[PDB]
Amino acid sequence: MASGVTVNDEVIKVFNDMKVRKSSTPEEIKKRKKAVLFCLSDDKKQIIVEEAKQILVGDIGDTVEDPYTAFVKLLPLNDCRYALYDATYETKESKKEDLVFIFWAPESAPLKSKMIYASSKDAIKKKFTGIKHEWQVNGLDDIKDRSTLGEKLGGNVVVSLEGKPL
Structure with missing residues (x-):
């Protein structure tokens, strides 16, 4: 019983768009x-991307109270998923921006959910040619820490991330 998952072209449009x-x-x-x-x-x-679970730059402040909370609302504790986001931070030397490949995998999600995506993890990463970052967060407590993010992209050089001091 062979099986495997691939990355939908939608993931590309997002990579090409986000890149x-x-x-x-x-x-x-x-x-x-x-x-x-x-x-x-x-x-x-x-x-494939879910239109219901995405965050644009204009959505934040029009219909969305926050980009993070918006993501925190979509994140299912009983289900694993992936997310690509562009981290905008400013260091003590200069301000820069980048994108990271995040893997949402809670402990409440079924093994069949973690395994299905695990099979596409490479396919989805293959389509992420050039992605120099990768974030593994199981729960919101793994990513809620604003520093946990600002560090993965820059580390101890980020004076502030997303407008918040690190």
Whole structure:
């Protein structure tokens, strides 16, 4: 009984979009994908993005109170999923931005959920050619720590992340 999962083309559009996301006018920035969570398609054979669980740069402040809390709301404690986000931080030398591949895997999720994604983990990562970061968070307590993020991207050089001092 062989099995395996792949990464849906949607994951690419997000990678190509999140890898080439440029800031020109706030009007376009509203469409600029800053954060997005990936889930299994209706076929449960590949990794596709869920429109219901994504965070744009314009959504924060229009219909969303916070980009983090928005993600914290989508994150299922009884289900594992992936999420790509762009971490904007500023160090004591200069301000820079980057993107990281996050893996949401709670301890309440079923082994079949962790295994299904585990099979696509490479496929989804393969599509993330150039991703120099990888975040493994099981629960919200693993990522709720603003420092836990600001450190993984920059570490002890980040004076502040997302507008919050580190």
